[model samples]
Target: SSFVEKMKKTGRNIIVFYGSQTGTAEEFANRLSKDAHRYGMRGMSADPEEYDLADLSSLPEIDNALVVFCMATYGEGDPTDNAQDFYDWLQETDVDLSGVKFAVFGLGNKTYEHFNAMGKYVDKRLEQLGAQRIFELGLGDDDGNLEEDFITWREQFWPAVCEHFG
Candidate 1:
């Protein structure tokens, strides 16, 4: 199916997937998806654990797939429980993301020394697998300002993303 067609049916060119603990990332992804639709673009949200990472290799180059990864860094900077499998899949050297264009929004508590480690790891792995980053990675602190940080990023994100697609 054509990418636009998929978006029309599903309501998003960008696939907003989050690996969230305590639901913050999930909420953020949903809000982003809603805004994408408001802007006349299709946006869908899902959980990273529920999606198949290998399928990413086959997505159309023109589809503009973006992953809004929101994962907490677990023990020693490991991926959150639900995200571990996807993280493992991304580590495969043979995996390909040549046709995928994506960005990561990492949710972490700066209070922790390993703040944003999970998101950082995912970003690196995606790049290694050949995905194009839409913008610099967004790292949010947990000092009751994560939402504000996300809003700040969102303001700059849409224009940057449109520029990429253009």
Candidate 2:
């Protein structure tokens, strides 16, 4: 089924996609999805591999909907396996994504040279593809307090979402 259709049918306005190797990103995606209820929004966690990357072009058709990316930086700043195709699409596609609104939160270890590269790349690439960013890109450092970072970022994130979708 198309992700756009699934979202409409499920009545989910927020779709949280994860790019994870050991599941931290996925966990964060789910947490973000569950947090939507507090803001009076419906959300669901998703895997990029489960749908067509091109379908993202149709995402804005749903009323008041937004997309979220919880991406983990794989070794040497590469995307996780599940997000490989989506990453490629964002890096290569020239489609008009003007109406798509999104937010990105990256999980990484500052101990590495390219901390949060995937997150940063996705945020910038989406802009290049003409999507609107509703919230600042979040970088969660696993070397220190990744969970704390997420909690703190999201505290400000939900309010911004509410303000945007209001």
Stretches of candidate 1 above 4 Å error?
1-11
Q: Write the per-residue lDDT of candidate 2 for residues 5-108, one digit (tens) a residue.
A: 99899899889999999999999999999999888889999999999868888997898889999999988899999999998888778999889999999999
At residue 63, what lDDT does model 2 achieve?
A: 88
Which pairs, if any, clash in model 2?
A: none
| Candidate 1 lDDT by residue in tens digits, 50-151 | 666677765664356565565667677778778888888877657767777777888887777888998898888888878888788888877669889899
The TM-scores, one per candidate, come to: 0.88, 0.97
Provide the global lDDT of candidate 1 against the true structure: 0.76
Candidates' C-alpha lDDT: 0.76, 0.92
> Which one is best on TM-score?
2
Error of 1 at 65 (Å): 3.4
For the record, the alpha-carbon RMSD of candidate 1 to the native fold, in angstroms, is 2.9
Worst 10 residues of 1 by lDDT: 1-10
